[PDB]
Design a protein around this ligand. Sequence first.
Ligand code: ZN
Lengths: 62, 81, 23, 225, 232, 717, 687
Amino acid sequence: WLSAASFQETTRVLTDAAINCRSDKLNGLKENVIIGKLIPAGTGINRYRNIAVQPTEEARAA
Amino acid sequence: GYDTPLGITNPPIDELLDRVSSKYALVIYAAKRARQINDYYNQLGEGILEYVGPLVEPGLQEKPLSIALREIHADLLEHTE
Amino acid sequence: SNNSVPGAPNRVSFAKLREPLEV
Amino acid sequence: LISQRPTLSEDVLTDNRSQFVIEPLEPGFGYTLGNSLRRTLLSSIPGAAVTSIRIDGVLHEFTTVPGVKEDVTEIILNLKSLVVSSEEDEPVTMYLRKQGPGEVTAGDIVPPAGVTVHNPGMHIATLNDKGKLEVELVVERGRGYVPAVQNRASGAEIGRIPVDSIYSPVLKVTYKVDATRVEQRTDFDKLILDVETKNSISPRDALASAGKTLVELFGLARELN
Amino acid sequence: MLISQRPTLSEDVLTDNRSQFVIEPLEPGFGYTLGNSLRRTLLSSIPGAAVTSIRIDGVLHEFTTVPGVKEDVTEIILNLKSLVVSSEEDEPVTMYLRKQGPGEVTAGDIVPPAGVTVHNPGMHIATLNDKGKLEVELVVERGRGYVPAVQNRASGAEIGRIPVDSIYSPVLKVTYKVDATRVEQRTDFDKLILDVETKNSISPRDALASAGKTLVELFGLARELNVEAEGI
Amino acid sequence: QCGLPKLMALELFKPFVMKRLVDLNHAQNIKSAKRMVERQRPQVWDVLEEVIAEHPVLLNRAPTLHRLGIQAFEPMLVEGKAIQLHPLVCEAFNADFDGDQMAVHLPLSAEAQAEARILMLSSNNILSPASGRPLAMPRLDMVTGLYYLTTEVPGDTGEYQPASGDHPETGVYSSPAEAIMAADRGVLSVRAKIKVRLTQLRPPVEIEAELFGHSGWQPGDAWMAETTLGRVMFNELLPLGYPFVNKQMHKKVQAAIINDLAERYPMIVVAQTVDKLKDAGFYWATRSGVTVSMADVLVPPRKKEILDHYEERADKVEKQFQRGALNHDERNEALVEIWKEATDEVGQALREHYPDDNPIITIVDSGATGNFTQTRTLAGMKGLVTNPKGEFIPRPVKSSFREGLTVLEYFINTHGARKGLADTALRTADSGYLTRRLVDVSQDVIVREHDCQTERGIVVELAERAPDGTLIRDPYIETSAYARTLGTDAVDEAGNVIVERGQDLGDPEIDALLAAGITQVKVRSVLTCATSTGVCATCYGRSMATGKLVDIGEAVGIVAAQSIGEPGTQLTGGLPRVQELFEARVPRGKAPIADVTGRVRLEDGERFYKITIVPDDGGEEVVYDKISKRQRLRVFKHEDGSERVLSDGDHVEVGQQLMEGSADPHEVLRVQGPREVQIHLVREVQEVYRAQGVSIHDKHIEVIVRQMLRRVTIIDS
Amino acid sequence: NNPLSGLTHKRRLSALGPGGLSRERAGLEVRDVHPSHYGRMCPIETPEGPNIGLIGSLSVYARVNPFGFIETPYRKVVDGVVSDEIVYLTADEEDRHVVAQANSPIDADGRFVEPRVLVRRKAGEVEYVPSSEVDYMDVSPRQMVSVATAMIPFLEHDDANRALMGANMQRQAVPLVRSEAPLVGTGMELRAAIDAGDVVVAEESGVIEEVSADYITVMHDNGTRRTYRMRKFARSNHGTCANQCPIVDAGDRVEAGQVIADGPCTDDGEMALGKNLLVAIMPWEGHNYEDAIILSNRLVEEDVLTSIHIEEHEIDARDTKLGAEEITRDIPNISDEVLADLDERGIVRIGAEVRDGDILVGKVTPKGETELTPEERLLRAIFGEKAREVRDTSLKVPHGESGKVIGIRVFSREDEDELPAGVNELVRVYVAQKRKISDGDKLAGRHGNKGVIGKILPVEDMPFLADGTPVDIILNTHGVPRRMNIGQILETHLGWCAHSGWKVDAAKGVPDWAARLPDELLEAQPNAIVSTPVFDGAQEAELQGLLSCTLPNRDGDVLVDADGKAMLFDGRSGEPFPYPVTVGYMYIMKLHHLVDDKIHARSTGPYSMITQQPLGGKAQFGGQRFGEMECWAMQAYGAAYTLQELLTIKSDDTVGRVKVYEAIVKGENIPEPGIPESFKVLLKELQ
Ligand SMILES: [Zn+2]
């Protein structure tokens, strides 16, 4: 309902949102842009996001 | 088989995409390692458990992103997807 | 000559049609 | 087809214009020589110009002087036409006082020892009965074109009015070549350099300054590594 | 005028007979003034020697094919034109090239008269057919730059002698571009880049130094007019 | 690289400069370091150079139509107060230099700079994500400059002469360096046909085989070529080892090279190669003599004779209207075809009268800019102009802009010129509105899987077989066949398979099936991709911008939406037709369809039209009622004659278009199935963009249709 | 902006406003050209933005009757006989007759040469008609165009698209320091300048008694004296320099209605919207790539395109809750060096050059003790500075401004000056900048050919003619045939003929191309002024003939051939350009779209109090708006972190933006973005 209320017919969507008492799972490009989360696309999906990088065992003296 | 890459085009974007799975994966690999190198320069004078320092010889006043991008080209790092 | 009414510089016009009414 | 050392001989047209012929040159060489001289002439010939001025009754360019027909801005634009040469190579001050009626010309300036005005008949301002003009003019010596030096960068206070400085004494330089393309053992290009100055220096003096410029400069390829 | 200091010349050696030179930093915009002048001085004002005309035995009115060799007439002229040579004699010098039997001709199989030197003895010239024989006379002269064969039409005798293009100049290819560099706060001070490829007659170093002397002498004619001041 | 003014970078990198001013001890504390930047103390300009080193910035020009509307560059401190933009990215931004402004955004975090360094860098985005064809290529002055030296001029000086008489062959040079020395002296022309022994360029694959063949040509091996000196200089620009091309460098020719360079050669080579073409094109455009003068605007020689013949025909149609033999509505249509035919005869009189040295022709015919219709309006005649109604005025503007329109000619011309600018503002609003509707409907369509393993696909018309025997390439290969991936092995008449399943259809791999005789392939499509939410990469196909398989996580839905909405600025059918399809409207055409396959029962009258169909198997007759104002589509009857106007007795199939127009996409679904209605919408939208000179891959159109059939209704709970 | 801009604005005809129509209630039918607009409203001059067609300019000869309709004059034709009797007709009155086109062939007595002539009829019909049917005819060919539209020479050769831009950009010209009348004219430049009212015309005939840069005194014949004061360096409504200058000298007999002094964009009484520049039509190393413009540095060295600009800055001292704002030189914690350019009152002194950030007016406001930061109260104790209960609120120069302070105006309640209630002092400071032509400044011509300055080469680098004179401006060839504006090419030809002069061969009669030309045109001196009236004027037959007989230079050589081209030399290498290039003089104008105003950048700064997002516009030191379309480009790239960074820490993250600034000055890494404050407001609004 958050991705719809920012598209068209803001009042018509917000009215039906509170009547049906809809809950929005914040998982979407347009939704994460509003709340400030990383968009689930590109470098924002959990596959590339949660990645640990460690150096190889070889290293110089200092 | 190309002219010497100058500036931000070095290391070449083609050889960098060989040690990685996708364009989006290389961004995270370089960025998170650049955070390690940057914390090493800010925790070199104070504190232990400082992040691992630069693996290649860095240039004078070289940016931590450029340092991390060369060592990825030099196969001096690992990964965990 | 062009606009010989106020005493302006002499600008020469390629005019083939006369002007019956001034601006 | 072997070498004969080229010769340069000067031809005079007027007191501030002279033609210079250089021959013999290798084929295709004439155009590049005339340009390297022209580019050095139009740019790096030393000369003297007015750096700043100072009018008593004014504090900036955008005002008028009582009795004079031109505003200070139009007066300064007329002073950009001034041609002058200085021997001092250091800041020196010219002066100008004139009471109306009458016209103030470039000859009405009293130059100090070393510097001299080369077109005393230039119009500067027109003064009526009530018009009084008193101007100081600082003249330095440089080369090329330098814009007006800011009052924040210099130590000059409010009264001083900086002006753009046009130090080049050459006015117009061109060239033409005559190629001997007769299919034979002998081909050569003859360069004809045309130099026009602004009565500050003679044309041959300017070409001599460009000559010592390029003789010194090309001497960088002769030194080994 | 005013002082303009610190212009230096550096050299990077790509090959033994091709180097890159950088004149940095120059004032804006002197990089273009002495840019095209340094190139034209190299390409057209260095004394060198090359073949002026040749004469092939067995070739009189045809010039289409030479019997006994695989290469035709014009293919012989090309690799002969690229023959590098130097001479201590100003006047023209005739050389002869002769070899019989099946095999291969080289620029080492030539016999050079005293004063001239062939610097590429391993250069291929012609392939000799079975029981093949080739006699050819070469004319070498001094000169500068590049002169067409049409001007050598009088140098050939009326007996199957053909004139050729003479690549007198020791340098082969010179290109130049100008970049920008910052000496203090100005960012338009010019950096000149010279890429000179030369024959093995002389190195790129001496070729550039040769062009500098002839140019200082050239602009010295203007300098002798008054010897007025100018900032170094 | 892009150049931003020094005063811009100092404020943009202000906190970074304040950090370094206190490190190098130019400032005591960070508090005074801020006052130094605000006061612009001379130490900051040396410090500012160290800061912006390899720190990318983002350039943006509104309207940000597609994703290349924002690109990352490496900043270089330049004087002045203007931003210096590269001439090759001008096509992506749609930016001319008549007063445009761009915005600069400075990424701060390590992730943001990495995204700008790798994902958004200009050199990594040479190809259009919409079509896969290059955008950063020689376009205006550059293509004209390259078109110059790659031109073969016959009588040009220094040309080759065959050996005749006492002199041997004239015009054969040992080295390209010698031909340079010849052109320097003034003997050889850069555009003259000569013979040059080349040593550092690979000969064409045609002639490389006969000379070497067994082993590839080697840098150092020699060979002869019959080109011009300029054509040799052009091939030196493209990388070493590339086959020599002895063609004339039109824009189409240069585009085919760079497209082939993007497929085979790596990215960094393509970036450096096109920079070489840029510098070379500008150099020779300066010396190509391209100039516009009044003498170069030649007028048709028979200008008076041509129009008087049509003034005669117009006077006879005007006299045929005086006696009432022609309807007033027909007189306009009759005179229009008289002057439409007249403007063609005047335009033809210009092409043959104009030489090819004329710069006005050289600009258009090189692919630089402009149409010949512009040149015809410039030198020949303006032609028929439109009044604010829409139809063409029965009187044309006979004068040319070189001649000078009359007072009444000029006044009637502005009628169409102003309304042309008037609706362009409105037509962009409906375009952008349609664009943002396409964005929201496909915003969350992401590549989440590598392969959904479904063997389902769709049949693509690879080529068409002519009746004579030869096969003609389908015009739809570029948008519907290339960059696809197979879902079924291609089998020719032999048992051997030419291309395996799951192989990206490259350029030679289409010729492999083309020369094999097979004319149909079954390819994986985003329509058939069975995935819970997003789509798998294998069914999507090759990313047009990346030139490889689409990575997992790329928001392909937003790319598809931007790829369709960017060319929407140029429409008339038209733009409202595209909205009729994406909104699933009951169309204006409302064309009928064949609900059941069988026999046609044409019962036509003049009061109305009613047509029945006897079902080919069982069933009962299905009756329709249509207005006589339509006409039947020439249906490809079973007779194999495509122009078979639907009369009674024809054998039409199920879901066959009856009369012309636009069949209701709602009714196409309830006849042939969801698989077929998706194919209809794709190539129906594709016809609107194809009929305008816009090539959008069917890939992007299909991504939107997938979101239209994701939902089903409930009949019984 | 310029006198033409002021004259056009008064003759504007707007459809918007009360009683008219709303912009949202205006279809494509109200805006396009109507056949009744002939000779009444211009079909060319109208903005190309969202107000196209809704705003027009009254035609030249048009007027308004006491009813409200627009009348246009016509010459009444009795019976195929042109009469000098002129009558004004309304729109519906014009339809009840038929009028002949202005350029009709007419006998010296008045009879039409052809029986059938092009004639306009009701409902916009054009057709031939008998000579005994013509009731009226047009007064002048330019009867349909506006004043600014009539100022475009060779307008009949330019398409309406670029012609619209040509007239609209003429109003955008900037008054230069000195002004040059154009070599190629239309005749309108004189009446457009005088009627605009920015010059100084003599009311009564007389002689010049005393002339100064300040005022002109005229001694009339009867004996009375009238003195006209000159408007010197006055700021216009748009920051342009309105500066008048006398033309007459001491003791000059001047007639009535004659221009004794001209103002901005005026030369000897003619609209001087630009300068005559030596133009070469050729691509040049890519620096003029699609509509870019290359300039010779001569225009910088000689102040050819240099213009004066004046800004107005203002600040007041009010009565506050804790005291009264006072304008004083004493400012807390400021060195004597910053205040060195101030007088004893705290005001900058006349003539002092001021950069951005310099203090103009030193004003301090008393701040309460209960309004102090914990760090600020400790910082006040560790410096021992008591009695500093006032803070700095001085008027400082905005970013991007710099110039000489030319005037100060002070208003004080103490000195009987009526200020709004609550104000004690008001100061206005006038700063003037001398703006030379810079890289990126937008130039343009009269044919809708616009472009920004792409490169200013040294004079030696510019392609120069045979006699060494370098060209001034290098216009790209590629941007000429597309726009259909050959008028610039035709002006370039006639512009060179005006610069050089001509002499037609008089021997063996007058040649066949100059038979139509007036006798005054057969000979011309260098730098001669000419008029090409709209829809009349020079034809291409006469123009081609003038290029053949161009006068030679001082050396006796003809530089430009008969085609209109000339051989140029590459000033960078010296080799001549391989082909001739069209070279002439074109009138170029400096438009009020200068980079000195259009450059802007921001690290941090003020934020809108409600939404906590950065401000907008350059005047408020605001940042750029990363709009909705721009976010789609980020997602299409997959640049997630760049998108999160833009919408959080770089915008409306209240704590994130501060922690980012600290992380930069500390050398630390960029922290993790928080929650946008604008989203917090959204929820509090939904509640
Ligand atoms: Zn799939």
